[PDB]
Amino acid sequence: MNIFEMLRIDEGLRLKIYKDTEGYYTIGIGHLLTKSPSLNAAKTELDKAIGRNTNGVITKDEAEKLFNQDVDAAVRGILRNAKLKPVYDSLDAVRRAALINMVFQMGETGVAGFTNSLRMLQQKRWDEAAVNLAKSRWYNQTPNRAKRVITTFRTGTWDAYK
Ligand SMILES: [Cl-]
Ligand SMILES: [Cl-]
């Protein structure tokens, strides 16, 4: 298992514009297009992201290309963030994947807001960080996915995904 297979399981794959769990226009493997309510504003962002007139539909190769860029961006945002970087540097390979997953889903700013949990992860207090991470809107809104990420932090294995 690796970050790509992990996020592919969590996000799924859709080749036509769809609405995410929050009602936002998305496409491919969890690629958010816009928070705007307008489907047209979504097709406009989509065409600009792909470089062609898509009419709201993309190919599997186009989805995977957006995915590769989004994973790269999440990793680079972690490495540039003064709050995230030190946590990331401190973790083992598996747990690093979990942090990437959270950043991919809620953005660097969102994750950097989990001040207490981050401190607990850096200290390697696994059980405590898992309890703290669950007291969140994140956990309450997407509980199955959150439990999977939290178990990954707790155990340091890919068990929740196998
Ligand atoms: Cl883009
Ligand atoms: Cl869920």
Q: Where are the chain's structural domains?
A: 1-162
Question: What fold, for 1-162?
Answer: Lysozyme (1.10.530)
**Residue 45 φ/ψ, nearest 5 degrees:** -65, -40
**Residues known to be catalytic:** 11, 20
SS3 content of the chain, % helix, strand, coil (to 5): 65, 10, 25
According to DSSP, the β-strands at 31-34 and 14-19 are unpaired
Report d(CA 108, CA 88) in Å as an integer: 12
Look up residue 3 and give its amino acid: I
**What is the CA 99 to chain-centroid distance, rounded?**
8
What's the gap in Å between 21 CA and the centre of ligand 2?
A: 9
**Unique residue bearing structure tokens 């207490």:** 116
Contact predicate 152/95, CB 8 Å: yes
Contact predicate 157/94, CB 8 Å: yes
Q: Facing residues of 28 across strands?
A: 14
Sign, CA torsion 68/105/116/158: negative
Structure tokens at 94: 């598996």
Report d(CA 24, CA 21) in Å as an integer: 7
Q: Helix (H, G, I), strand (E, B), or coil: what is residue 124?
A: coil
Q: Facing residues of 32 across strands?
A: 26
b (16+ CB within 10 A) / e for 72-89: eebbebbeebeebeebbe
**Ligand nearest 58 Cα, by number?**
1
C-alpha separations of 23 from 10, 35, 36, 37 in Å: 17, 8, 10, 9
What's the gap in Å between 51 CA and the centre of ligand 2?
A: 32
Q: How many residues belong to the chain? A: 162
Instruction: Give the residue numbers of the binding site for substrate.
Output: 32, 104, 117, 132
